[PDB]
């Protein structure tokens, strides 16, 4: 690993600098190096890992959607333009899959198995669901069903733990429910399940806000608003 010679603390420090500089590929590489040191990650470090790869894959997903839309238009009275659109869509797709495989590999070797506290285990299982979901967005072949089921299974295990071990306002639990609801709506073709999950999550969080400090209230209501935003689009 290219980061093998750098101190763990230096990798974390540089990840934070990379974030400030909006250098998300660098940030992700630094955080991958930090994970590969073999020690568990603190809450702050988990969030650096997630922010870094979310930004990287987000740029790839947006690019893939642009190219896929052009490719679909080319297959409608449309003039033949050769293999280039498909080729370039495939190039971006392969790079996106590579990033997802990298994240899933870090989770499997060995972040999840060492994560015993609910906050860390739920966080990593949610990430596993997310990156299988991004794989599912581009999957078209004989493994699409297994990719979808891998996302579902990771989200479901995260949900089971979060309901047992975390309050309904916990921001990790809320973000998991938000993402699993989008999985249901967009990936599993289950809009009713998506709506039910988002509504129940929102309502149970609402009922628990009274227990929170001002700062926790702000954290939780921010994510609740995202649930509401989706419900408004879906109903």
């Amino acid at each position: 690993g290219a980061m093998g010679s750098m101190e763990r603390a230096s990798l974390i420090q540089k990840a934070k600098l990379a974030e400030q500089a909006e250098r998300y590929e660098d940030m992700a590489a630094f955080m991958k190096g930090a994970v590969e040191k073999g020690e568990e990650l603190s809450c702050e470090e988990r969030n650096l890992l997630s922010v870094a790869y979310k930004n990287v894959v987000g740029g790839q997903r947006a690019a893939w959607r642009v190219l896929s839309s052009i490719e679909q238009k080319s297959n409608e009275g449309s003039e033949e333009k050769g293999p280039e659109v498909r080729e370039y869509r495939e190039k971006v797709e392969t790079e996106l899959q590579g990033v997802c495989d990298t994240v899933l590999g870090l989770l499997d070797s060995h972040l999840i198995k060492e994560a015993g506290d609910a906050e860390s285990r739920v966080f990593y299982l949610k990430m596993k669901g997310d990156y299988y979901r991004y794989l599912a967005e581009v999957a078209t072949g004989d493994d699409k069903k297994r990719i979808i089921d891998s996302a579902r299974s990771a989200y479901q295990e995260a949900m089971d733990i979060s309901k047992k071990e975390m309050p309904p306002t916990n921001p990790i639990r809320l973000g998991l429910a938000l993402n699993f609801s989008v999985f249901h709506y967009e990936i599993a073709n289950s809009p009713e399940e998506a709506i039910s999950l988002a509504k129940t999550t929102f309502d149970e969080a609402m009922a628990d806000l009274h227990t929170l400090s001002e700062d926790s209230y702000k954290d939780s209501t921010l994510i609740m608003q995202l649930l509401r935003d989706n419900l408004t689009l879906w109903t």
Binding site: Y24, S50, V51, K54, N55, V57, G58, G59, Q60, R61, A62, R65, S69, K126, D130, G175, L176, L178, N179, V182, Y185, E186, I223, L226, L227, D229, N230, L233, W234
Partner: peptide, 12 residues
């Protein structure tokens, strides 16, 4: 594509 809200950086 219309993207629904998911957690964290709206980076796409």
């Amino acid at each position: 594509k219309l993207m629904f809200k998911t957690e964290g950086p709206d980076s796409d």
